[model samples]
Target: SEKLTFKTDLEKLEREKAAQIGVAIVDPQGEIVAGHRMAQRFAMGSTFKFPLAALVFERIDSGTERGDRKLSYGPDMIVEWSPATERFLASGHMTVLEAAQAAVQLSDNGATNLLLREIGGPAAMTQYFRKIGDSVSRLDRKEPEMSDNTPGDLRDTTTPIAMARTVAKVLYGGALTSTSTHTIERWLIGNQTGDATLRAGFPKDWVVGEKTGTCANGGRNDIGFFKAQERDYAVAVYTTAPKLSAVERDELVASVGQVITQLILSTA
Candidate 1:
């Protein structure tokens, strides 16, 4: 009875505080366990880095791109929220592996742009999603610019289902070589950005791999996986409220995470 409240839960948020929320959870077999606003587009923010990283790994796996090859970027390439890349800026370059790790593990904007350039561009990232069979997600711009989040714009947006499917594909499906799969999964589980969002809902012993995204337009998102005993689940949650503070957005997602935990546990 408490599991389907995602719709009304977001309704309460909308009526009391004005926020749009989306949720999706898929079991190992790509079955939708629960979804709300599954097809609605929302700004993706840094969540796109996961797919971008998957693309880079795919290229590496195909021998088209070498992970150890260095990608050079000048000081002008630096952007806000680049903790992992800025320190290395003095060197004027970072290896492809380093940049990809920075992008996914820390949400490093500069590293992501450099990797995007290395992998062809924003169009290549979008094309890779198409190759992987997810037709709904789009990456029209690089970071910083991608977070514009203007009303009614389709730039850098993804539906809850699309994002969930994408994560499931890269993490569990045969989208990449076995080596690349384990490599990216390791980086995902090591991510440093999603502590208070989806991961916060799980118990201390539960291992949840996740990616977190935040935008200037009051958007917050978490996309990743949770494995319980023998079952694996992919989940995504997004929230947008121009008036909601950072803490509020995270707390709202965490509250929903508790319900999700209940949902998954009961099913298992």
Candidate 2:
């Protein structure tokens, strides 16, 4: 039992967590190399912030907005889970680039609300997802509300492939300028979040850029891309376990994420 392989490790994690796990790994060509619970929807938590960041980047890339544009927020704008914006709160505003980075890098809810307002709010984001061709991904309400994680509720939900497909499209499928793509990747490179989940699953030195989402009543997610063996792949691993503690939920995502990466690496 002490000497075991990934197969046993993954099986044990799954059995212990008893979670509803969703996974997808997509290639540069927009073709999937691996997926589990392919069409299952899970609570997005803060994971949706990445695409919002992408939308912001797209605006900057297309000349509709600038990185240095100032975004201001007040106490009234503050939402739950917003410590990342505390530094900016005293200043009353932050540059758009900083806001976007905070949203993706920190999953900062106050900054997320600011970015959402900057981008025209939740429905606009959902429509933008449609514009980007993600049919199964959606957002209905703003943060703190969208993260309710109520059973069977569809709001602010995303399928594994839906998330993987959109993320791959934006990062690798020519949806943004090469500059925007790399810069977005740069912000995610040393992201402050995601230590115990997906990040913990991979070997050190493999460049992993990811976003983590934590929610009550069991919603934990990590969606991002990694370059290994000279091949770039976008991956999404979301898991839900009602009875598990915070650490267990993270382990659930980590375990499934590890398996998904191995599956992608082994593909031709």
Candidate 3:
């Protein structure tokens, strides 16, 4: 009953703010500690890069792709929210490994498309997710395509549970070769993006590896693993607040992080 109250109270607060939110937390042993609408799909924004990177690594493992292979970054691949790739536009080329790094750490849209093209587009990514046993998450279009205002543009969506599951598989469940997993793990830990969301709520010394995503209509997301002194846990928090300001969105995400951490500490 106490657990139910913890989950419901958080949901009520978010609901009152007119934000659609989903949260899922799993302990090191794969036990679900708390959840709310975790199965409901929400726009993934940049969080889609997580599984996409996993798929790229899988190809690398199979010898179908090489991380060191160099690729050209023509004008066609340019898109907004790509600070890392913007500098490289003049050079017009980067190695596959660099592209992956930019895609994850900087959430570079251009870099993401480069990887998507290499892996055969959004359909290929969704196919890979299905192959890996993720059923509720799907990537249907490139970042630009999904960004443009269109009717029924839910082509990129993921459930909180699905995001948590995917992260756990890649980080701990041996979903990829050890080398490949380590590569992605390093990129996540070294994420260069601002740490105003999940990281904002945790201790400065705590190791919280995360990826953040923001898109049209107030879609805000952060998904990752948290390592504490007591136990390791995985969390995914996705929210939509079309009417909220950027600061408000950041606060909401940070609050979610605090709430999750509180839960963990209470039970520990």
Candidate 4:
């Protein structure tokens, strides 16, 4: 139940199993338990959707964007998804609100690609990241694509520390305007369908608003806020591996979550 002392052997054991795993469990007292690679950069993937959600909400409150506004994705708006690309001209529609949800919950590449354009594209995303003290988090493409087809640098960039900081801002309702914060919180609560990764540890009643990132070679990354607990935690996890399916990776991350909550409950 006591604070987990730095366990050198345990750390080594996990490293041997999971490639480049990162964990940060902040207790109610704001104490760090096990934080490895907390600051190390990783490919953010869909996890970037949360920041995008915040950006769109901010614009809505500022009159730069109108929430509930109907946006259509026909051809030009469709950039990434190969499936969507083939059916680009097909009649498919979604509002900004719905688009945000799809982007976060379904990890809809097309939906996120459209949201990026609606929210003033990569320029605004970059600007918002800077305002939130995460200037280094860069969008790899203005429009999502399958791959760069370039030499080697074809990855979206982000760091676990930067993500946790953004989550902290959202948790405190300081990241965006009051209205925007409310909308974002609602979106996060509904959009978090990934019952794995950093979120799998909390109690059933615990409120988790999160977004997950995954790739074939980059492994999985998730960042989010656990709310209403006596000791709320801002969690970030990143891993690197190959061949492992999303299902297996999620299960492994869920195990980490279990350990986190068990440690907290035992201490209390």
- lDDT winner, 2 or 3: 2
The TM-score leader among the candidates is: 1
State the C-alpha lDDT per candidate. 0.86, 0.83, 0.81, 0.65
Query: Which portions of model 4 miss their true places by more than 4 Å?
Result: 1-13, 26-34, 76-92, 142-155
lDDT of 3 at 93: 87
TM-score of each: 0.95, 0.93, 0.93, 0.81
Off by over 4 Å in 2: 1-12, 265-268
lDDT of 4 at 190: 69
Higher-ranked by TM-score: 3 or 4: 3
Q: What lDDT does candidate 2 reach at residue 140?
A: 91
- The sequence of per-residue lDDT tens digits that candidate 4 reaches over residues 113-155 is 7788777777777788888777667776743442221323434
Tens digit of lDDT per residue, candidate 2, span 1-268?
Answer: 2113434555566677677777777887669766767689898999999999999988998999899999887788777778868877888997889988989888888888888888889988998899888988888988888888998998899998999999899888888999999999987777889888887877676788999998777888999988885788888888888889887787777777677556555554
Candidate 1 shows a clash count of: 0
On lDDT, the leading prediction is 1
Residue lDDT tens for model 3, 181-233:
88898888888774788888776767788888887877788998888885777
The superposed Cα distance between candidate 2 and the true structure at residue 177, in angstroms, equals 0.7
Model 3 worst lDDT window (10 residues): 145-154
Give the runs in model 1 whose Cα sits over 4 Å from its true position. Answer: 5-7
